[model samples]
Target: MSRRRVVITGMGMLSPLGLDVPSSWEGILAGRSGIAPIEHMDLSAYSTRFGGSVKGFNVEEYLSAKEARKLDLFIQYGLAASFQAVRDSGLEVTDANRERIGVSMGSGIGGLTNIENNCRSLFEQGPRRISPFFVPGSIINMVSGFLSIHLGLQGPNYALTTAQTTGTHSIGMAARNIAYGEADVMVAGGSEMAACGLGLGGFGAARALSTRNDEPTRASRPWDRDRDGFVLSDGSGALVLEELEHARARGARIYAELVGFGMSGDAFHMTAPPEDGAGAARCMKNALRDAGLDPRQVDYINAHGTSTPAGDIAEIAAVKSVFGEHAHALSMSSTKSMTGHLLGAAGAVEAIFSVLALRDQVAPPTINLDNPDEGCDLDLVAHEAKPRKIDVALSNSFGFGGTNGTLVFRRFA
Candidate 1:
């Protein structure tokens, strides 16, 4: 049973809270809300006018005007996060390792802004006016395609689109590629910029977004009795995962070891989980089993508590079922309360937060949780960050198609 081990060497992120990992993690630990009114887009017609939008981002810092204009904002954010991850890892991709490196980044809704604009142009100015960049710019896999070309990574390059579970599945599969000897390293995660007119209008039509327009900061209150729905957010989160020996050989900075990954399909509903949360429990149990660890060994959980009433309580039920008596002892929190819900990028950033929680010995707070809702009795790490001895952490993500994924990370010794 010889399998290559995978470890996270570097991480990067772009969220409403900040443009990089350190700043975003800082905002999470400080319990600062990044949700606010949408000023970049005309959301006047939408029922939910507020969201978590990444501000002050300059695409020129990562791409030239000519190149940036052709690609959508999702691709731009993904590349920016990839650049940060590559730089942080300090893994020089010479001819020797270029073929062994790859990328697996994705998005829940790719190029919605571009599509909306181009659709308007096509209708108003006729079909010939559509730009040639429309297809490549709007497709989901271009993030991986462009990243591989830009970085000269010749290994496996692909993107997995699974609604909100995109990021977790992408990273998990990337790690599997390394574990199975398909590659030595992978730049993996998800990126999204869906906080536009159509993006907002679509989710609003489905009644999936919070309508607390007057109090944006207090909108994403996961596990709270007064919670409404998840706030749409735009951002990207990326991580550099390398073979254990490869990282040790280069004297790279290791953040945490990715021990296990698990995935499941609910087969229950299109956008809702069963009240029992059986699928989520199976997912977590699979990850723990793969990690060869007991439920009691896990010290923290970065839950997919997207502030939706059903989702929050369902995840809590899943945790209780998975851990039994230990669920009440471990700290479980949702940083979405501060950053809103990053949709496809949520799992990647939460995975980074999970690794950081292990490294920093602190569990981030679930802000705006004035009072926990019924059956949300777990230690939700509400209101304030708590310092604790966290050795292992599990990050969970469940998507619209009832797709679920979980990653188990252990603190690097």
Candidate 2:
């Protein structure tokens, strides 16, 4: 059977940078830093007292107050972003096609805040004091479940919980459903709301968080020599993907073509990437092959440079190995330097950035790169956004348990 073409009809994000899609994109183009001293909680004693936190978000605007309280913040984020994406797509669900649409969303660490709060109550008062919603609110799979029921989607409701690879994997799986004629449309992406006490403390205990508490804005310096570690962040992103013919028939605006998806495992370390980048390289190569394109065809890469020393260098090595001489021509930027690390949501948010790059012909800055690392030699697009024509762009996302995923996108003609 011939593979059906898939295109992104609409995109949305509730990011640390902003509440809506346009505001987030504007912040990206303006090179703004969403990181600041963590204010959502008391972090005075923590080594990393900062994070990329969403500001001034009112869930009541998107969901009812009682309804919002029943779900965790992560689910709230998923629902809000999915709502925006559905509205943007203008793909009204009539009686005829309601069952043809699906939902595939994910979260790296679902309901960490909820678990922490409930655990405290359980320990302090007793198990009897725990809310009955604790179990439902803490489960990662509920992200898709809530979205499917709320949107009246009755097809292929699923969730991928592959840590940081969750978003990329969910999107990839959703695309395959459309390509195989199992579904005509899929609302896919990822969300994370783990910027609370345990979230920051756990990463810091693992030495995975930057300790530059004084300069929170510059903490996530990807590919920079002085970088310490990633700054924890929280947010969500969603995209409405539809079969090309179906979308065109509805006169929906196509953002970009979801051409290829590749995934691999490092098999080297649970928390670290292979030094040789074998896994990362294979993922990129597989994506290029799946897209029916060569390495030279890719114009930009939204790197999964989590500002960690090893992860950044390893990803660069993978790019060089896959692209070879063409690596120099491709611009790579880690928007995490500005948005911090959104964990599962990182890929989807950066996918939006990649689509916009193709649409606007401008690459967002990596930001906060003071000293260039000798190993990461590719153009990191430091300090300022640059205008460039982008026909094809790739987004890389790696996660714990050695999982890696790559997605390729192209502008719609």
Candidate 3:
């Protein structure tokens, strides 16, 4: 049962708020809404027209023009965040250490736009018109594959494409690799850019998106009684996790200690969780048990409140069942209110927010929550950020097919 200690030493993000971690965190604290109407494309036929889109991101900053052209937007975004994380960790990839480092990054829906375009080209023009790089560029594991090649990392390299929980699982598995002595360091997280014609229309047809096109900023109102459905989003977030001693030896800036990671399956439904949220409760309980801490020890939680009516109430119920009396005392907020649902990237970005909350003792706000639903009686940090003593924080991510993941982070002394 012996395992190495793991700590988050560096983080990176490319979100609708901005291109970096500080800017994204700043937007969350300010209660800024990044969701907006879909632009540059005609979505007149779609029920949902708005989404959280990454703006002002130039791929040249991460890859060359030719290399960027061969990859999809999701790949570009993931590489951008991964490079930022590796640089921030300050862990030099030398000949001795390169083999000890690894990469774990993924997307819930990889290369949607690329697939759409290539399919169009194959049908409209000819089979020979399809680009050779199409397969490599659109595959789910290519982000980690290319990252390893770029950084000379020769350790365990892979990706996890677990719907919305993709990011959470990727980081969790990366930490496990280090804890289990398979790797000393891992660059891990998720990225997604599924805002193209097919991506938007597909989610719209499924009725899983908000139709509040007129009020784009206020559309992602988690826990609000008037909430309709989640607003789709696009972005990437990455973290540099390293063994505790390895980090200290390199003098890296430790963000927080990743104490626990838990995962579960609903076993009841595919897209909808049970109204009582039993699966989510079990996931949280598993995470708390793994951390070797009581429920009362958790100070703050970045809830997976995705603004869907059933999901919001279900998460609240889950927290209440798991924490009991402590649930009422702990402050919980959903940054998805501002970032919308980043699909695969949501868990990673929210994990970064959870880490920051532990470091700065400030809980980010759940914007646009004007009327809290009946079951959401907890301290739903609404409208504005809250300053409190936060020594421990938890992040939750629930995905389709009943998959759920939770992470517990403690402030590093």
Candidate 4:
């Protein structure tokens, strides 16, 4: 039997560029960069002092003051975006269907800020100085748990932690839960708030973050020869995925059809991909095959170009290998050039960007691609937005531990 069709009915985001989708996307379309000096913590000790930190994010917008105190910033951001998605979807929780709705949201690093702060308290002050909310506030599954509690959703509550692919994997798995008759609706995506000392210090120690501290805007230059490493970021993106017929029954406005999902692993390294892009190539081919689409059909690609020297080149090589000549014809851009790197939330936010590409029939650009790097010959949609009627777009996410995922979205008929 054919699997049930899934459609995206609602979306929400909290990014460094803006608090909501409209303002964030406005910056994206304007070819603006969101990277800047991060003030969330004292960056004095860290090599990289800047990040894509969310500006003027007020938790009171989504949660009560007393209630918000129990959750970490990561969970709060997740709840903020998830609440926006739920409200946008207008998926009412009736007495009969409350048990049939679900949540599957995740975070790349569940409250690094919270953990680091509490650890400091335990060391300097005392064990008793740490708040009782630390464990519940910082756990990976707390987003889904809080969502279920706040909204009456009971089906298929799952949370994933897959490095950078957390959001993409969560979204894909949520769709599977619905296709397999486990749920009728799912609020799925990811959030991350790792713009703290430990978060920046860890990646900085690994030499995985850009240390061009003087030029924050130009730091996250994906596919650019001068690029060194990715910029750390904090944000969240959430989507409301519903069974098609059920959505239709409610006269819901559909944005796009979630046609395919593909996942693979490099099995080669802990943090680095295979140099030749073989593993990444297979991931895209799998997504195309799953979508029943010829590679030529993909109009745009939201790449996992993290601005790291190795990653950008590897992803480009994968596109060349997978799409062949079509790679040159198709437009592939790294919004990471603009939004910095949201890590776990990157896939989900870029997923929203891909859908918006279909909705607006325009491709957002890689803002800092003034000079493309070697082997990055494909159209990077560089410098400015491109107007095109996009029918299908693919979003790629590759995480540490060599995990890879791709999602294919088709324009709604």
Candidate 5:
């Protein structure tokens, strides 16, 4: 039963660009850059000063004042996105199907902000003063836990934290659950709020963030010669995945068929991918095989281009290695050029963009691509979106600890 077909019926997004899916997709099509100054905190002392902060987000919009107090920003974002996704799906909780619904959303760094504040409180105000909600709020799986409790879902509950691959892995594993008959419907994706002082300082010390403080919008220049480091952004992305027969029986509006999910390990380094990108190449190849697709079938690729010097080129090499002559035929773009890097949430949001590309028969662009570096010479939809007949879309996400994952979606039959 693990081979049961799965499809995405709904999607939700809370990104630096917008609060929901429609606005974010509109922004993407317009080639808008959501990168800006870090208003969440003072970055005066931090080396990197900008991030893809979700602007003008009111927690009260999704949660009550008292209800919102019990959670951290990451959980708040995840819950909001989950709620939106379920509502969009119109997946009512009936007594017969409640047990078949599950959740698998996660965050790469669960409650960093929560942990930081509590760590300070424990030392400064004594251990007795630690908030009772600290542990429950900061743990990664609580994203799914809290969502399940809110929605009354009584099926498989899971969470994963594979660095940047968190969301993709969550969705992939949830699809497995549906395919394997463990569940019929799953709320899956990732959330991240790793833009705080410690979060920035940690990545900054490792020299993995951009420092172009004067020009915030111009940062996140993926595949460009001036590319520096990946930007740390805060956001959440989610999808309601349903079994094909279940969705069809209820006449659910299908967004796209989740055709393939592939995973791999770089095993070369802790933070850096092998320069040759052999592991990334294998990951894409595996996904193509899982999808039963030839290289020529892919029309657009939502790249894991983090705007870093090494990563951008390495991913390009991987694409070329896997796609061969067809690599140049399809357009690829780095949405991080606009939304910055959502880290764990990046793949989920980019997955939405891929489905949108397939739905609209158009491809989004990589903004801030003033100059393309050598070897990054694919027909990138740069500076503007382009119309194209998309039959299949591929999304890539590579995380730390040598983990890599790919998801492929095809237009529904």
Candidate 6:
């Protein structure tokens, strides 16, 4: 049987930059910085005083006060973003098509804030003090569980938890489900609310977080000579994936076509990529092949440039290896510079930016790239968004445990 074509019908984002998709995309396009002094909690004890945090956000608009309080922040983020996506799609699922719509979401470290709060209560006040809702609020899969219930989606409701690769995996899996005639529509993306005490402490202990506390805005300077590490950020992003025929039949607005997806494992290290980025390069090559296109055909790339010294350089090497001379023409940017690192939500948010780039014909900037590293030689649309007619775009995401994922999108014909 011939595989069905998949396309992105809608998109949503809850980022440190803004609450909704348009505001967030506009903030990123204007080269704005979402990082600032941390305000969610008291950070006087920690060395880092700042982070990328969503400010002035209220969940009561999407969920009731009681319902919002029942779920953890991760689930709240997912639900809010998914709600926006479904509304944007304009593909209402009635009783007839309810079974054909599904939900697939993920998170790298779900409910860290909730877990920490519960654990502290347990230690300080004894185990009996633990909240009865602790288990439901802290599990990784609960992101999707809450989303499915809220949206009344009953088909293929599942969650992918591959750390940083979670969002990419969710989209890839959703696309595959549609291609295989399993689902007509899938609300796919990722969420992460781990920018709390425990999450920071753990990543900091592993030396995975940047110690540039004073320069929070410039902390996530991917491919820069002075780069240190990724800055932890909290948020979520959602995309509505629909079969091409189904979407066309509904007269839905098509953002872009999901043409290719590639996944690979480095097999060299748990936390680090291979020296030559062999795995990353292979994933890109595979994606191009899957799309029935060549590397030169891609005009833009939302790089998985997490601002870490090793990861940035390795991914740049992979891009160069895969694209060769055409690498020079591709406009690549890391929006993580603006939104900080969203962990599992990184791929989904970046994919939204990629699709927007194709739709709007402009590429978002990789801000704070004042100093360039010798290894990263591509034209990273630095400081400001650049206008270009992007016919094809790729979003890359690499996670811990050496898992790498790449998704390619083409301009809807």
The per-model lDDT (C-alpha) reads 0.93, 0.90, 0.92, 0.91, 0.91, 0.90
Query: Per-residue lDDT for 1-413 in model 1, tens only?
Result: 26899999989899999999999999999999999999986777889999998989998888899999999898999999989999999899999999999999989988998998899999999889999999998999999999998889999989999899999999999999999889999999999999778889889999999999999999999999999999998899999999999999999999999998999999999999998899899999999999999899999999999999899899999999999999989999999999988888899889999999999999999999998999998899999999999999999999999999999999888
In order, how many clashes per candidate? 0, 0, 0, 0, 1, 0
- Candidate 3 clash pair list: none
Poorest lDDT segment (10 consecutive residues) of candidate 3: 33-42
lDDT of 4 by residue, 243-303 (tens): 9999999999899999889899989999999878877898889989989999999999999
lDDT of 3 by residue, 1-413 (tens): 36999999989999989899999999999999898887858989889888899988998888899999999999999999999998888888899988899999988999999999999999999999999999998999999999998989999999999999999989998999999999999999999999988988888887889899889999999999999999999999999999999998878899999999999999988899999999899999999998999899999999999999899999999999999999999999999999999999999899999999998899999999899988788999999999999988999999999999999999997
Residue range 1-413, candidate 6, lDDT tens digits: 47999999989889999999999999999998899888778878776667788777799889899887878898899888899999999988789998999999899988888889999999999999888899998888887788777778888889999899999989999999999988999999999988788887788879888888888898989888999889888889999999999999989999999999999988889899986789899988988898999788999999999999889989988998999999999999999999999999999899898999998999999998999898677899989999997999999999999999999999997
Off by over 4 Å in 5: none
Candidates' TM-scores? 0.99, 0.98, 0.99, 0.99, 0.99, 0.98
Model 4: worst 10 consecutive residues (lDDT sum) = 37-46
What lDDT is reached at residue 151 by model 3?
86
Q: What is the lDDT of residue 374 in candidate 4?
A: 75
After TM-score superposition, the amount by which residue 161's alpha carbon in candidate 4 deviates from its true location, in angstroms, is 0.5
Cα TM-score of candidate 6: 0.98
lDDT string, candidate 2, 41-86, tens digits: 8887788898888898899988889888878899989888888898
User: Cα lDDT of model 6 overall?
Assistant: 0.90
Q: What is the lDDT of residue 42 in candidate 1?
A: 75
- On the 0 to 100 scale, the lDDT of residue 148 in model 1 is 90
